[PDB]
CSV table of C-alpha atoms in Angstrom, one decimal:
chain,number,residue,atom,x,y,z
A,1,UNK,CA,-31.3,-28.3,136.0
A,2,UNK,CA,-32.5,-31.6,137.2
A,3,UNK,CA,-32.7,-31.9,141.4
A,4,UNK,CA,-31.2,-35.6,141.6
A,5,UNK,CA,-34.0,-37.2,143.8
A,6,UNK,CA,-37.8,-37.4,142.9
A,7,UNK,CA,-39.7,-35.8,146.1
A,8,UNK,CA,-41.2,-39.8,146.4
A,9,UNK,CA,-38.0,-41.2,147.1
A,10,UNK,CA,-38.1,-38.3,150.3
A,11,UNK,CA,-41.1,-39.8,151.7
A,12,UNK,CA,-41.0,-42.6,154.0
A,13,UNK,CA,-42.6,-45.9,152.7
A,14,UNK,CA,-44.5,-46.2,156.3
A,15,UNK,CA,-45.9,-42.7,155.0
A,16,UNK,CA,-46.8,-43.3,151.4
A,17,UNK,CA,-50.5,-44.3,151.1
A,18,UNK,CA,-51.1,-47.8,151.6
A,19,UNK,CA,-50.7,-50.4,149.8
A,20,UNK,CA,-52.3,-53.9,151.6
A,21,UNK,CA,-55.0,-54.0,154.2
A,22,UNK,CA,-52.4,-54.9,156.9
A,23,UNK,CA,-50.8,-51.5,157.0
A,24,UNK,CA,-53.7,-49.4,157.4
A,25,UNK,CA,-53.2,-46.3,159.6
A,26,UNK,CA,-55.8,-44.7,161.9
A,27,UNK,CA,-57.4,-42.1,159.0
A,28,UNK,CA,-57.7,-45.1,156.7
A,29,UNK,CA,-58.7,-47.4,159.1
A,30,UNK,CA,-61.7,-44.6,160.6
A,31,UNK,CA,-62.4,-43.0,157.0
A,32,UNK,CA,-61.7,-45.7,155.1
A,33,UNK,CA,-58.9,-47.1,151.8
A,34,UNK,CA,-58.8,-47.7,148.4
A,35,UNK,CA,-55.7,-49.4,147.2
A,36,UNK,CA,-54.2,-47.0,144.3
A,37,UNK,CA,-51.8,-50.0,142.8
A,38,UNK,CA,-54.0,-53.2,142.7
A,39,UNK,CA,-56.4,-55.0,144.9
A,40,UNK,CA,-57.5,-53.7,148.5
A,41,UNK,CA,-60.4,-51.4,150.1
A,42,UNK,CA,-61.8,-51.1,153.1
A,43,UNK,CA,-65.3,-48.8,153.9
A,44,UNK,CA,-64.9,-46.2,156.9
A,45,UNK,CA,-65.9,-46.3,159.9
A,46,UNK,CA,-66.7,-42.2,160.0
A,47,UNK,CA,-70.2,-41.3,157.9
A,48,UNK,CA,-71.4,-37.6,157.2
A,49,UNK,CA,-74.8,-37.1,156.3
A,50,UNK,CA,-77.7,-35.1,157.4
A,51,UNK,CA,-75.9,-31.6,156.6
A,52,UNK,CA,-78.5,-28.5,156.4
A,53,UNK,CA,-78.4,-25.1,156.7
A,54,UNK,CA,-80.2,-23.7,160.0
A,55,UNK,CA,-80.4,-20.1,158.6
A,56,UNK,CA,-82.0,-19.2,155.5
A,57,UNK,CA,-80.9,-16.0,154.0
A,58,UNK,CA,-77.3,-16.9,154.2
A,59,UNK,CA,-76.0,-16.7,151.0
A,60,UNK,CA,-74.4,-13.0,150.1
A,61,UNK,CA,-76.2,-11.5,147.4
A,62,UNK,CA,-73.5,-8.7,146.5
A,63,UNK,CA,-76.1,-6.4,145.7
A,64,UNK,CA,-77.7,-7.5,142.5
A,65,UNK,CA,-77.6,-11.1,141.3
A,66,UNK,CA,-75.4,-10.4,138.3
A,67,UNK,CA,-72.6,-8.9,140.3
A,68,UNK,CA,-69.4,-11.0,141.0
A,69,UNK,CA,-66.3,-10.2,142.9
A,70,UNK,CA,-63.4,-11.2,141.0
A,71,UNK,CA,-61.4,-13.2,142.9
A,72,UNK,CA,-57.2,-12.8,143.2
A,73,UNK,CA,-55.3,-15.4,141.1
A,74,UNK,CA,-55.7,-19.1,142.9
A,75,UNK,CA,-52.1,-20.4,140.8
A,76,UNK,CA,-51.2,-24.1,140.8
A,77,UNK,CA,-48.8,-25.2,143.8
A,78,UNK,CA,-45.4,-25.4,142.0
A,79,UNK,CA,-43.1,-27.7,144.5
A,80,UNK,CA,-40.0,-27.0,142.5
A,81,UNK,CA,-39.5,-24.0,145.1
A,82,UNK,CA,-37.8,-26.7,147.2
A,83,UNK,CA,-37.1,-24.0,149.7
A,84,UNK,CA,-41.3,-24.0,150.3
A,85,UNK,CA,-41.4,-27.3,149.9
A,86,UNK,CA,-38.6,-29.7,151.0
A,87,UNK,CA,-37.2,-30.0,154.6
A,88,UNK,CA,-33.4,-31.0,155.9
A,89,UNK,CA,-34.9,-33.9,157.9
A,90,UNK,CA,-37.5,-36.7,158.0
A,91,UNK,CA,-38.5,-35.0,160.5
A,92,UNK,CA,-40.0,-31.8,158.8
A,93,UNK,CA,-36.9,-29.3,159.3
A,94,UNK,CA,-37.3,-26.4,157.0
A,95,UNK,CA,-34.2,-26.1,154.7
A,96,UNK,CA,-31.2,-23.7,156.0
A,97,UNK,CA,-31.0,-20.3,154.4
A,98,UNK,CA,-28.8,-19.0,152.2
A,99,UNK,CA,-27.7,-22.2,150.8
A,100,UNK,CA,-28.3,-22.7,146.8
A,101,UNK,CA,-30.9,-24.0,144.5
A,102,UNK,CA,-28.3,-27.5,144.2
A,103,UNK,CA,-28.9,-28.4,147.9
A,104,UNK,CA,-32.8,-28.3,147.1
A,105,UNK,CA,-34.2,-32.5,147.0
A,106,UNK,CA,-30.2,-33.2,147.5
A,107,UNK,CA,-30.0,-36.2,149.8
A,108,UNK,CA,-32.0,-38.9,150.7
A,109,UNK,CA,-32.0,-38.3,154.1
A,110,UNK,CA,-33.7,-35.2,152.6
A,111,UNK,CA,-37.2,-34.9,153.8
A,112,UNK,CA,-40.9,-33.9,152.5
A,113,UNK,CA,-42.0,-30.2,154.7
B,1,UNK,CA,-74.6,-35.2,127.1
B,2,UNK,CA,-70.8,-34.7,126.6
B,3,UNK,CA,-70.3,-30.7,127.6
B,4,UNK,CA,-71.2,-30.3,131.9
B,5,UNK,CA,-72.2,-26.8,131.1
B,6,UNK,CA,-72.6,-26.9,127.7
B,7,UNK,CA,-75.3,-29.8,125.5
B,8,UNK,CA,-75.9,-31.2,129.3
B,9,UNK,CA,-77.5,-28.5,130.2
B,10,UNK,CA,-81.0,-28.3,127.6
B,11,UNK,CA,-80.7,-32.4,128.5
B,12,UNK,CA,-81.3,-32.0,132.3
B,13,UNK,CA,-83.5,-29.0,131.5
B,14,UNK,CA,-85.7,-32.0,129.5
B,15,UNK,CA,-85.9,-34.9,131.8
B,16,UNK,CA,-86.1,-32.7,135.1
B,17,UNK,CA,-89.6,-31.0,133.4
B,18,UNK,CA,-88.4,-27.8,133.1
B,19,UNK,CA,-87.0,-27.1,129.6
B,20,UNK,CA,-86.8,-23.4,130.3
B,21,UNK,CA,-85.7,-23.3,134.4
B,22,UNK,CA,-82.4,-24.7,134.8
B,23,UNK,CA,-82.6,-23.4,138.1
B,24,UNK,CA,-85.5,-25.7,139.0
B,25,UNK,CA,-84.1,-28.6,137.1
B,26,UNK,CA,-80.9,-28.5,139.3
B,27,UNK,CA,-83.2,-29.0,142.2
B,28,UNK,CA,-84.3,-32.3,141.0
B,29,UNK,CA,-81.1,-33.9,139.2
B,30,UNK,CA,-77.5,-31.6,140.0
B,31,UNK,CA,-74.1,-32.7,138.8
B,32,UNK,CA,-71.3,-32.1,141.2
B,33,UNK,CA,-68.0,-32.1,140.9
B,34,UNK,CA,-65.1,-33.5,143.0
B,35,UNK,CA,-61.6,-33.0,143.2
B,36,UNK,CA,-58.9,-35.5,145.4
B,37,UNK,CA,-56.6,-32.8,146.8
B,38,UNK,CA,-53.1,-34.1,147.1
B,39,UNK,CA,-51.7,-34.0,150.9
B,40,UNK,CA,-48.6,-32.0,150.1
B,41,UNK,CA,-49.3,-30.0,147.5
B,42,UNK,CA,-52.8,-28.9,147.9
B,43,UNK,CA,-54.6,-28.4,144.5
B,44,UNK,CA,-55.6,-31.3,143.0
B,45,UNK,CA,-54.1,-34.6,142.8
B,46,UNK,CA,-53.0,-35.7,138.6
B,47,UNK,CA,-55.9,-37.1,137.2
B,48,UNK,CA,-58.2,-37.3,140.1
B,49,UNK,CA,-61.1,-35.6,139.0
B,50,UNK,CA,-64.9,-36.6,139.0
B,51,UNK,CA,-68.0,-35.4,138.8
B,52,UNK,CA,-71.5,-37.2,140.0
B,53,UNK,CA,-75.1,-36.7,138.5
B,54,UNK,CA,-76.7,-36.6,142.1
B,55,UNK,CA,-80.9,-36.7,142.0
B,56,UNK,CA,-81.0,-34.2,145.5
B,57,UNK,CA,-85.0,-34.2,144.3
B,58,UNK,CA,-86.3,-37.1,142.9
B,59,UNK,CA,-89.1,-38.5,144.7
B,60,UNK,CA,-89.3,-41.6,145.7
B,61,UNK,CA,-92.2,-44.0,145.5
B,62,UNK,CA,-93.4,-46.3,149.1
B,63,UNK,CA,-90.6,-49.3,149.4
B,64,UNK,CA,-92.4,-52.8,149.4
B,65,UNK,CA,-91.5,-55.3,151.8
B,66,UNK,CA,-93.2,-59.3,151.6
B,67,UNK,CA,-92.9,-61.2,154.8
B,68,UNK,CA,-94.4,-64.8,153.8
B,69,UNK,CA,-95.5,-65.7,156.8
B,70,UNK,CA,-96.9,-69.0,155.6
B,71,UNK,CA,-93.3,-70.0,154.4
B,72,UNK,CA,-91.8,-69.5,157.7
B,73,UNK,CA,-94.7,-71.3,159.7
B,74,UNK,CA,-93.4,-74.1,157.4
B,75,UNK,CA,-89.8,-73.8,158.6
B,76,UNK,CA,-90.9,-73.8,162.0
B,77,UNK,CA,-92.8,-76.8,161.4
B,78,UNK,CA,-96.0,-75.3,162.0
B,79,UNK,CA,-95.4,-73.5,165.3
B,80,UNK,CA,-96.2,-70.0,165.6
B,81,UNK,CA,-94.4,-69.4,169.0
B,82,UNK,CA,-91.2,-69.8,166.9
B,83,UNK,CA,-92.5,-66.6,164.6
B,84,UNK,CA,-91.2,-64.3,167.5
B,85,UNK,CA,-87.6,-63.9,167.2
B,86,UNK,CA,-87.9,-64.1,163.5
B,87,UNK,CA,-90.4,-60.8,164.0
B,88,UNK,CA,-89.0,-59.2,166.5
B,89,UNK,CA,-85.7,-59.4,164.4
B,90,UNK,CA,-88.1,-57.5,161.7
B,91,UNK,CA,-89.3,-55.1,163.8
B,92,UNK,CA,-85.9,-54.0,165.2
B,93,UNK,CA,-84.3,-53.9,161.8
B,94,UNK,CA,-87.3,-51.3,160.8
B,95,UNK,CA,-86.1,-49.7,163.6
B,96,UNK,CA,-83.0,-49.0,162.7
B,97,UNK,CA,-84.3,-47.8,159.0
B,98,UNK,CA,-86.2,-45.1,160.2
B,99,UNK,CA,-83.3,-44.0,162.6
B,100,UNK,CA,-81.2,-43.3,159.7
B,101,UNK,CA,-79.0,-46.6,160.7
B,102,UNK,CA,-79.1,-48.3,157.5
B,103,UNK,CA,-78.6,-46.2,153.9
B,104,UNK,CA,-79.1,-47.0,150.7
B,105,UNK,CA,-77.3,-46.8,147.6
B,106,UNK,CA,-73.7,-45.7,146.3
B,107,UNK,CA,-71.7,-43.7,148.0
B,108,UNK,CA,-73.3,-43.7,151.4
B,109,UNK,CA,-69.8,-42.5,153.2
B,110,UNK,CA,-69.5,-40.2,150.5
B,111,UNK,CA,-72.5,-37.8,150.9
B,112,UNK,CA,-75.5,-40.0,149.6
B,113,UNK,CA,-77.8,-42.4,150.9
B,114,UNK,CA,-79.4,-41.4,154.0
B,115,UNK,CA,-83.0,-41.7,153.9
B,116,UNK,CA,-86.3,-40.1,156.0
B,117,UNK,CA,-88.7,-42.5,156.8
B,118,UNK,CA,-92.3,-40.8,157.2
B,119,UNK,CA,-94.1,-43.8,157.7
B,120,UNK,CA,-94.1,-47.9,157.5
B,121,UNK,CA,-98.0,-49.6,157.4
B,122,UNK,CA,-97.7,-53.1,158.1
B,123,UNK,CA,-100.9,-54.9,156.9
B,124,UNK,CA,-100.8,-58.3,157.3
B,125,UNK,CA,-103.4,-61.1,156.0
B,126,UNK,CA,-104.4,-64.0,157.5
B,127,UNK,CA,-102.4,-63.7,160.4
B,128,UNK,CA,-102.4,-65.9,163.3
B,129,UNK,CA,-104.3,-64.2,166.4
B,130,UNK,CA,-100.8,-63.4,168.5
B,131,UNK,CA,-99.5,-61.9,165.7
B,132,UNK,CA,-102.9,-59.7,164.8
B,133,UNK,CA,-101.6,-56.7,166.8
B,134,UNK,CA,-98.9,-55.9,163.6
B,135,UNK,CA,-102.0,-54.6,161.7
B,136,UNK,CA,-100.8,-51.2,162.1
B,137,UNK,CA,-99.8,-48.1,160.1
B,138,UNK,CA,-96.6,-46.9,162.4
B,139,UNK,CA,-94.9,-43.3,162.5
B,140,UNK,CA,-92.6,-43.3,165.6
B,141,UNK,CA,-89.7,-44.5,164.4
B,142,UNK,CA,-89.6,-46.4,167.6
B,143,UNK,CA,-92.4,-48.8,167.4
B,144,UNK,CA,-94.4,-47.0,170.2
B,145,UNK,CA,-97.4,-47.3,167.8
B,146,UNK,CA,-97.2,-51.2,168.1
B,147,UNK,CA,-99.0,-51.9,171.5
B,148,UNK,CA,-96.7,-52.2,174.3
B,149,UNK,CA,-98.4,-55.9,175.4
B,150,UNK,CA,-97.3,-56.7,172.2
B,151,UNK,CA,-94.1,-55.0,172.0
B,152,UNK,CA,-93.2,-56.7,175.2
B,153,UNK,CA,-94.0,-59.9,174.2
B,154,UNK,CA,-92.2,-60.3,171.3
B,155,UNK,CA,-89.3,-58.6,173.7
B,156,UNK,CA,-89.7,-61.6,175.9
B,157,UNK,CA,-89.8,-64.3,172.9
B,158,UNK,CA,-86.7,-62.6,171.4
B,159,UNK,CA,-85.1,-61.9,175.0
B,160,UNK,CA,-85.3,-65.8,175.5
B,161,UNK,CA,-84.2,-66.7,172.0
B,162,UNK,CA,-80.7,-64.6,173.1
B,163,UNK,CA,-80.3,-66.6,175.8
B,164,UNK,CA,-79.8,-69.7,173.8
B,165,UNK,CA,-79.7,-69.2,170.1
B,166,UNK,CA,-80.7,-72.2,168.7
B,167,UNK,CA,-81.3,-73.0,164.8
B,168,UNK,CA,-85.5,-72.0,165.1
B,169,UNK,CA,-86.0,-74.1,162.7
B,170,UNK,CA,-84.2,-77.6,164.4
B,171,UNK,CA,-87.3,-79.7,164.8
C,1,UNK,CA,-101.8,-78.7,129.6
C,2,UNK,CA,-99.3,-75.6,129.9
C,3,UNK,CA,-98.4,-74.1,126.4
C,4,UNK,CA,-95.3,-72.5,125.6
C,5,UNK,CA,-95.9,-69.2,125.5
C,6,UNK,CA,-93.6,-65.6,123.9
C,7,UNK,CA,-92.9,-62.9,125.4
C,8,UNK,CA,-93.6,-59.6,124.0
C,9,UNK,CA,-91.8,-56.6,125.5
C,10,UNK,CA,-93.2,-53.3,125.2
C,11,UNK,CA,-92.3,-50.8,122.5
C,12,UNK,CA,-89.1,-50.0,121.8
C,13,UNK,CA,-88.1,-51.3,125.2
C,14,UNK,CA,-85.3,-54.0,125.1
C,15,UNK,CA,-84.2,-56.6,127.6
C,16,UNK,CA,-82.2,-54.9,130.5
C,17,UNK,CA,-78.8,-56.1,132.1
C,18,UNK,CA,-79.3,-55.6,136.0
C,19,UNK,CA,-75.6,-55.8,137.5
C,20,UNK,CA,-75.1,-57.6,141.0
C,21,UNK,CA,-72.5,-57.2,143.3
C,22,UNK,CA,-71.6,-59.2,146.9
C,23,UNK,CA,-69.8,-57.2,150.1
C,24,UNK,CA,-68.1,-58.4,151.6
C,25,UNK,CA,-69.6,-58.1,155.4
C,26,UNK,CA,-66.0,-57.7,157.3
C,27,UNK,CA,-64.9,-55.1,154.8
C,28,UNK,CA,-68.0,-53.3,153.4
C,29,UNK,CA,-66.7,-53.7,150.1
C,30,UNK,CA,-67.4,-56.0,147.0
C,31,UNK,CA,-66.3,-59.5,148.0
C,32,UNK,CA,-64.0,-61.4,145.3
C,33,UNK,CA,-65.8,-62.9,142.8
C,34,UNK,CA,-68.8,-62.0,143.8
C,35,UNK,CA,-69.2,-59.7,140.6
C,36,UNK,CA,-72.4,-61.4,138.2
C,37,UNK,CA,-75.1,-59.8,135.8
C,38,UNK,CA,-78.9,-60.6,135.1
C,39,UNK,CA,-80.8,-60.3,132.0
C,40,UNK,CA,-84.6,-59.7,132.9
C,41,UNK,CA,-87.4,-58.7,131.0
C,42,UNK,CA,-88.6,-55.2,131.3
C,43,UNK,CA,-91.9,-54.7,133.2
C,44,UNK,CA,-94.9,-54.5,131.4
C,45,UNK,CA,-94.1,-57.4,129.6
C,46,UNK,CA,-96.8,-59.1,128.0
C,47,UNK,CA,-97.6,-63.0,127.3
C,48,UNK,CA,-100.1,-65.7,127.0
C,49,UNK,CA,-101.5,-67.5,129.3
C,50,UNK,CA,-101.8,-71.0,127.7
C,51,UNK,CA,-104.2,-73.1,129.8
C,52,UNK,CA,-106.2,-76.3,128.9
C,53,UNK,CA,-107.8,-78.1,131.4
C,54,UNK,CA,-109.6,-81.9,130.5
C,55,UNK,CA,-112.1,-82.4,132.9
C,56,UNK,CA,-113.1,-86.0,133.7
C,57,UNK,CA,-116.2,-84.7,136.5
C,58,UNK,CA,-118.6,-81.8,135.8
C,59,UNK,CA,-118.4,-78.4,136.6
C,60,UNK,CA,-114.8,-77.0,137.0
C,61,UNK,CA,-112.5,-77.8,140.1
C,62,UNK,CA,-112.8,-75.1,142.6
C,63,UNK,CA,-109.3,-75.3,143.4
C,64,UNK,CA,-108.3,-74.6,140.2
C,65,UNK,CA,-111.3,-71.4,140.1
C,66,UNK,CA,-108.8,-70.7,142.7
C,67,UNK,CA,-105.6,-70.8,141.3
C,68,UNK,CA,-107.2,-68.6,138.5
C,69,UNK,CA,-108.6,-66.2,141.5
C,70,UNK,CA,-104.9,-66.0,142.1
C,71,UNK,CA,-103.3,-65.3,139.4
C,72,UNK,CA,-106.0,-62.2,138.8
C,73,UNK,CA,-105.0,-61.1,142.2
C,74,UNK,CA,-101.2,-60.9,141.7
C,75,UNK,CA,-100.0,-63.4,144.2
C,76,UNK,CA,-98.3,-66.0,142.0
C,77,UNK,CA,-94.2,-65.4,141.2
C,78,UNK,CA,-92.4,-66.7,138.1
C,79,UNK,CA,-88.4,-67.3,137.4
C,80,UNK,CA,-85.5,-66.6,139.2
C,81,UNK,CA,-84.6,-63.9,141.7
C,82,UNK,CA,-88.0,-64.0,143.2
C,83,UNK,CA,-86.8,-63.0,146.9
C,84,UNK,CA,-85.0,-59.9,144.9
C,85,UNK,CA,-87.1,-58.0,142.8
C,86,UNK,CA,-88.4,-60.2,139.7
C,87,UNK,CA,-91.2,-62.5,138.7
C-alpha cells in the first residue's frame, strides 16, 4: 500500500530549506546557502581551517597493517517505518502505539519526527 | 581517468612522480570524497555525491606583487606625502595575509585555501627617501621588521587620512 | 617603424581559455553577469621584434638605447589584463 501523503507535504514550508535570500535562518545565514530550485547563495559567515593532529601515533594499527575489522552492516535509513520516522504533531510527537500501519503519514496535520 | 580507484590511480601515480608509491603520490595530489547527508534521514541525500582532486602537497612558488609607485606619484599629482595612506593600506592588507585573514582559491569555507606565509621581501627601486625604510625582507607577520619610526609614521599619515577620507587624488 | 609581427606558441601547446568570475562583495558569491572568459597566449610564446629606426642625426638616440635597455630587462607590458596576470 500507498501512505496517502508524501513525508514533504509533513514538513512545514518555514522548515523546508530555503528558497530566496530573504528567508534565511540562523545556520544558513552563519554557515552559509545555496538555493536548490534556481537563483540564490550566500557564503558563511563560520570558516574551518587550520585542523592538525597534535599527537602522532594516533592511528590504530590493529596489529599488522593488512588486518581489518569488519565492520557490522551500516543499511540504508528506510523511512517507510513511519513508526521510526513520522510524529502525531508538528511538533515532533512520536506516533501512539498499537495503532496500524494505515495511520502511518495519515494526516496533514501529521508531522516529520 | 574515469575509475577513482581504478585507471586514476597509475595516472596520479604519474604526474605526482611516483609511478610505483601511491602512498607518496596521495601526499601530493588526494581525491576526496563527499557526501550531503540528508537532515532526516541521515545517509546520504539522492544524488548529492562529489568528490574533489585536492593538491594537500603541491608546492607553491613565491607570489609576486608590483606596486608602481611612479603611476601613483602621478595620481597624486606628484606628491609623495599622499603615498601614505595608499601604503599603509598595503602594508595592513599584508598583514592580514600572513594572519591567515584572507585565503585563496575555491572552496575556502569548505576546507581549502588557508595559506602560511613564511616570508614577504619588499624591494623597492627608486624610491623616494621617506619611503626608503620598505627596503626590507619581513617575517613577523606583524610588520615589526619595518622600523617602528616608520611604522608610526605611516600610522599617523593613515590615522589622519581616517579622519577625513578625502578622494587622495582630488587635486 | 613597428612591423607586424606572428606569434608562435610553443610545441604542442595551444591557446588557453582563462575563465573570470565577479563576487559579489555583499554576498561573497558570483555577482550576475559577471561571468566572462579570456583567450591568452600560453607563456613562452615567441615573436619578432620588428624595429626600424631612420635616423636623421648621428649616432643612435639614447633614449631609444633605453627603451631597448628595457625591453632586455623585462619592464615593458603588452595587451590587455596587464594589472591581472598577462602581458
Amino acid at each position: 500500500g500507498l501512505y496517502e501523503i508524501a513525508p514533504v507535504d509533513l514538513l512545514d514550508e518555514t522548515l523546508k530549506p530555503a528558497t530566496d535570500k530573504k528567508q534565511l535562518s540562523p545556520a544558513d545565514r552563519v554557515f552559509g546557502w545555496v538555493n536548490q530550485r534556481g537563483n540564490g547563495c550566500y557564503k558563511g559567515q563560520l570558516r574551518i581551517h587550520s585542523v592538525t593532529c597534535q599527537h602522532d601515533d594516533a592511528i590504530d594499527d590493529f596489529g599488522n597493517q593488512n588486518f581489518s575489522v569488519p565492520l557490522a552492516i551500516l543499511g540504508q535509513p528506510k523511512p517507510e517505518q513511519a513508526r521510526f520516522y513520522c510524529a502525531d504533531d508538528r511538533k515532533g510527537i512520536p506516533l501512539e502505539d498499537g495503532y496500524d500501519r494505515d495511520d502511518g503519514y495519515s494526516d496533514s496535520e501529521q508531522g516529520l519526527r | 581517468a574515469t575509475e577513482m580507484t581504478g585507471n586514476l590511480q597509475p595516472a596520479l601515480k604519474q604526474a605526482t612522480g611516483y609511478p610505483n608509491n601511491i602512498s607518496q603520490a596521495y601526499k601530493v595530489l588526494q581525491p576526496a570524497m563527499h557526501v550531503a547527508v540528508d537532515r532526516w534521514t541521515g545517509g546520504a541525500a539522492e544524488g548529492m555525491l562529489y568528490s574533489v582532486l585536492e593538491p594537500i602537497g603541491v608546492t607553491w612558488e613565491p607570489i609576486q606583487v608590483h606596486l608602481d609607485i611612479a603611476r601613483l606619484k602621478n595620481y597624486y599629482h606628484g606628491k609623495e606625502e599622499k603615498l601614505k595612506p595608499a601604503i599603509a593600506l598595503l602594508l595592513l592588507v599584508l598583514r592580514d595575509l600572513a594572519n591567515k585573514k584572507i585565503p585563496v582559491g575555491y572552496g575556502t569555507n569548505r576546507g581549502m585555501g588557508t595559506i602560511t606565509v613564511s616570508q614577504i621581501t619588499l624591494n623597492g627601486k627608486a624610491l623616494p627617501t621617506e619611503l626608503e625604510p620598505l627596503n626590507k625582507t619581513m617575517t613577523c607577520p606583524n610588520l615589526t621588521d619595518l622600523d617602528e619610526a616608520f611604522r608610526q609614521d605611516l600610522s599617523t599619515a593613515w590615522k589622519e587620512w581616517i579622519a577625513d577620507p578625502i578622494d587622495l587624488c582630488q587635486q | 617603424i613597428v612591423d607586424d609581427a606572428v606569434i608562435h606558441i610553443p610545441n604542442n601547446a595551444d591557446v588557453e581559455i582563462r575563465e573570470g568570475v565577479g563576487i559579489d562583495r555583499h554576498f561573497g558569491t558570483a555577482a550576475n553577469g559577471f561571468k566572462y572568459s579570456r583567450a591568452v597566449i600560453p607563456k613562452g610564446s615567441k615573436f619578432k621584434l620588428p624595429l626600424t629606426f631612420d635616423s636623421q642625426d648621428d649616432g643612435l638616440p639614447n633614449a631609444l638605447i633605453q627603451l631597448l635597455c628595457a625591453l632586455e630587462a623585462g619592464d615593458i607590458r603588452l595587451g590587455a589584463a596587464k594589472t591581472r596576470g598577462l602581458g
